Amino acid sequence: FPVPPSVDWREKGALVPIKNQGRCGSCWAFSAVASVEALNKIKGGELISLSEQMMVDCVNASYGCKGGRQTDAFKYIKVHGIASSKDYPYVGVQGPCQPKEIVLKISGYRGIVRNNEKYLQIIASQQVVSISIKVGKDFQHYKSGIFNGTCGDKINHGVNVVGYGSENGIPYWIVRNSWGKGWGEQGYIRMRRNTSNPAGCCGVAITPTFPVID
Template identity: 50%
Template sequence: MRTTTPLMALLLLMLSLAAAATGMPIASSSGQIRSEEETRRMYAEWTAQHGSPITNEEEGRYEAFRDNLRYIDEHNAAADAGIHSFRLGLNRFAGLTNEEYRAAYLGLRLRSGAVGDLRKPSARYEAADGEALPESVDWREKGAVGKVKDQGRSCGSAWAFSAIAAVESINQIVTGELISLSEQELMDCDTSYNAGCDGGLMDDAFEFIISNGGIDTDEDYPYKARNDSCDANKRNRKAVTIDDYEDLRMNEKSLQKAVSNQPVSVAIEAGGRDFQLYKSGIFTGTCGTDLDHATTIVGYGSENGTDYWIVKESYGTSWGESGYARMERNIKETSGKCGIAMLPSYPVKNTVPTGERSSA
C-alpha cells in the first residue's frame, strides 16, 4: 500500500496550488492528478449520495463541486504533512459555493448588544482559579444526547435545534428519560423575537418553553424545514418542561465546568469554507467571532496535546464526524474558537414533575 510521506505531501501541496492558479487538473491527496473524467465521475457519485443541492444550472453546480474538491485536496495534502489537525471531505455541502452555504444553512439572529449583555447571568458554573474539573466528558456515552437531526435546506433554524438539544439533554439528566422534542413548535409558535427559518436565539427559545409550560415531542409536532402557523392543540401538549435558563460569562474554564454538568447551547462563526467542508479531526481552521450559527456542546476532551469541544450539529449524519465536530478548546482568545465562549446558555430543570421517571 502506497503511503504519503511529509515531503511528498508538501510537494503535492505545491503542485495543487500551482494547478489551482493555472486551471490544470487537480492533484489528489494520494499524489495522483485528477482528470476531468475522474472529477466528473466523483461529482456523479456525490450527487447520487447527497442529491442535488440548491437548484441552479447543472454546470454551475459542477463548477462549485470542482472548486471545492480542489480546495479539499490542497487542505488534506497539508494535513498529511502535519500542517492541519483536521481533514475536509466531500460532505453534503460540497456542491455549494461558500456564499450559498452561508445564505442557506446557518441560523442565528442576534439581538443588538446580545454578546456581553447577559440576560440571566449565573454563578452556578463559574470556575475558580485552579479548580479541578474532569479531564474529559462525553454526554453521548451517558445516554443524555438525542439523535443528530437535520435542519434541512434553506432554513436557518439552527437556533431551534441548539435549544432543543440542550433541553433534551437536561431532561434526561434529571429524569433518566431521553425524549426527542419539537423544533417545529419553536419555529411556528415562538415568534415574539425568533423568526423560524430566518433565524433566532436560544435564550428566547428557552423563555418560550418556560412561559408555555413545556414543549411537545417531534413525533407529535414533526419538523417541516419551513415556517408554518402555530398548531395550538399541539402547543398545549407538553411532554417536557424546564424551570429556567441561565447565561455564562465569556470564559472557557467556566464553559468547561458547565459542560461537565450538562450540554450547553452556544453560538459560533460557522460561515467559513473550512467549517463548511469539515470532515474529521480537531477543527483549528480559520474563523472569527462574527457569530452566525447555533449549535450545542455535548462534551470535551483532548487528543495529542490539543484540547477540544464535542459539538453536535444540525446538518445530519453525513456532515463531519457522523454529525459532530471537534473544535479546538482553550485557545488564547477569551472568545474561544470561532467565538464558542461568547454566548453560552443552558436550560435549568430542578424538579421532576409527577409522572416523570426519576434517574435516582
C-alpha cells in the same frame, strides 16, 4: 468545582440522534432544544426527542426559518413547554403553531460569563450547553479531526457543547451540529479548546447559555 478531564454526554445516553435542519434558518431552535433534551435525561427523565418545529412555529419573539435566539426558545419552553418530535415533526418550513401534548416545561435558563472557556468547561461537565459560533467556509467543509481552521466574520450559527476531551495533548470541545449525520464526525465536530483568544475557537465561548429545571 472538581472537573473531569474528559466528558461525553453521548456516552451517558443524553443525546438523541443527530438531526438535519435543512435549508431553514432554525439553528437557534436546534441549539436550544438539544440542550433541553439532554437536561431532561440528565435529571432523571426519559430521553425524548423534542420538537424544533414547535419552536419555529410558535416562538413569535424569533423569526422561524429566518433566524432567532436560543433564549427565546428557552423562555417559551418555560412558559408553554415543548412537544415531542413524534407528535410535532420537523418539516423545515414555518407553519402555524399547532397544538400538541406538552412533554415538559423548563424553569429558566442561565448564561456563562463571556469569553471564559474554563467556565464553559465547568458547565459542560454537568450538562449540554447551547453556544453560538462564527461559521465560514472552513467550518462548512469540516470532515474529521480537531478543527482549527479559519472562522466566519459574524456570529451566525447556534450549536451545542456535548463534552470535551483531548487527543495527543490537544484539547477539544465536542460540538453537536444540525446538518445531518453525513456532515463531520457523524454530525459532530471537535473544535480546538483553550485557545489564545479567550472567545474560543470561532467564538464558542462568546455566548453560552443553558436551561435549568426546578
